[PDB]
Amino acid sequence: HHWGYGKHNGPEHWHKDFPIAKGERQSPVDIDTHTAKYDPSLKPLSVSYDQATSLRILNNGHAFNVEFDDSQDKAVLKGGPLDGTYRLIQFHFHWGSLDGQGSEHTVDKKKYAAELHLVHWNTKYGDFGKAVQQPDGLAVLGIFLKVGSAKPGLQKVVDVLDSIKTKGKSADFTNFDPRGLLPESLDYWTYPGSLTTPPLLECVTWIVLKEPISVSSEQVLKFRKLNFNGEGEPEELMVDNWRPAQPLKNRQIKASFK
Template sequence: QFVCSLSSDDCHTHQSPINIWTKMALYDPFLKPLKIQYDPTTSRKIVNLGHCFNVEFDDTSDMSVLSDGPLNSRYRLRQFHFHWGSSDKDGSEHVIDGNVYPAELHIVYWNSQKYESFEEAAKHPDGLAVIGVLLKIGEANPVLQTIIEHLDDVKTKGKEHSFTKYNLARLLPNDLDYWTYHGSLTTEPYFECVTWIVLQRFSRPKFAYMNRSASYSREACASILVPVFL
């Protein structure tokens, strides 16, 4: 796994993202299939964080949860967001066999079976789980268009807008085979609290509106070309 070289205070031995070399990945027969439960009624709002936008969910109950796979607990859905770049060749955070993809979806969960809150969970090695899904450029798709249309409602930092009854399952591929590793947040304070689950298949909908999305990102982030949040 990637060892950060910025400073000894901020960087450790399990930093994310990483370059996944598929031929070096080890098959573990004891890993279970992912068990994902989404309730569209738990989606609440879209929020401009200044460097990125989040779609946030009601995480006060176990209505939208992730379990099994590499996990030993039940994890509650908190939010999802996208990473993209200034071109179609530098958007994804994770790299597969040296290949960077146009965009990456991150679906963020926290260990609600063991901890009382997201903030508390983020302090522990088994606190968070994130599903990473790579996206390609393609034709217009209504699943993503629904999100893109709401970006005009949250053009400035701190703005938020109602975003309800969104079926997140429609962003996932049919095949949920995955790579997994223990890693970190990709922004400060770089806590090594994340079980990463990177899907081996691309998202079903493709990122058709990357140009408009990138424009929004630059407006919201000033000089930041690649929005990063976890």
Template sequence: MGVCTSSTAQCRPRQSPIDIQTKRAKYDSSLKPLFIQYNPNTSKRIINVGHSFNVEFDDSSDRSVLSEGPLTSHYRLRQFHFHWGASDRDGSEHVIDGQTYAAELHIVHWNSQRYLSFEEATKHSDGLAVIGVLLKIGEPNPVLQSIIDNLDKVKTKNKESPFEKFNLSDLLPKERTYWTYLGSLTTSPYLECVTWVLLQEAITISSEQLQHFRGLKRSSENEDEEFILENHRPLQPIENRLVKSSCKHKNHKP
């Protein structure tokens, strides 16, 4: 898929994130349950990328994959990261019926059935599949804490540390119903290559845990100190896109 150089909506009709309006989302009986198979032995490292931190996985084989749901291929797990705000009131990228959340988890996969690499996959409209999970303020999340305990090792941009044997499945909510739509990356260059799968049940994070995210720096070691206080993209026009739901009745759990 070619990359459009214009910023007009006509040229870029499937930008993300969007406001999911649950009453307008269409139930689609053909949507299958998600098949998620994450092997803890594929987690490799945690790295500060300057605008967030990534937990990266070995994607040289199909040991950790996502398939079914709205997808017609299988997708290899590449990495996950978070988006957050300067306060607990907002930070999520997607919004549900106008309601923002404290943060949002993005789990990034690429279409290894059709393409030879992640980089090649980003050039195609069906190249990536991203699971989005909303985070709400609540009880401390023990699975998140195992990640937060490693953030001091990657305080500044480009710092990395081994992060192995992490079971990403434990971070997901028990309920796996979802909304899905065609969209884009939410970081530059905003490539329109993403099938979004936004889970309808949120997970918790405590205010104290979230504060650790804001303690990361977008600056390198030898630069003036600058913290990543927020890193979420503004909402984009939905245009004429259809949001589909895997659940017949509204099952959103704010």
């Protein structure tokens, strides 16, 4: 009855309801590291999450969102390719059924186990809904996950997942520090793209970090116990909730590093 990540409603079908799926600046893409251009004029990336106020975690039937208070400039992304100030509104992940798949962006065709998206909106547009209608409305910070050592800063998220197993379930999720999800280095690639889920709006500056974070097999296994379905419905494990790479078309990926 609507969009998802199965054979019958997955990414290959989305263009019928959302023709922009075949548009000029769709995401994700493959990042060909030997085609990206170092840009020495890119300003340093500024992640300012000290005053972040998390509120709630929600299973929306596609992923889970950790939501933040974005009523003021409490957690912001600036610098790099960005003009102005972008406010953190939520983060979520995309992940696979197996460790060898799950990311949306790929790097020289390599798929990672998962990908974290920290979603920010351009404050010059006043609200998120207006921002998504602008070509520079959003900035999404993308971070790859590989399976190795546990990420301590992820554990609070993992442990609450039992309480939001099914579509529509939410739980209080205050006092979470998203700085615990970042890698050491802020080296990145950047390109103009889109939301990777319907409505696939072409409003995103993508900033994808080069350094993955490591999470444990046990942590990702717990992501994979979530459900796409609602309570009291036949179980559909929430896995493989990623859109594959889309054609780059008339775009350039810039690198912050050589």
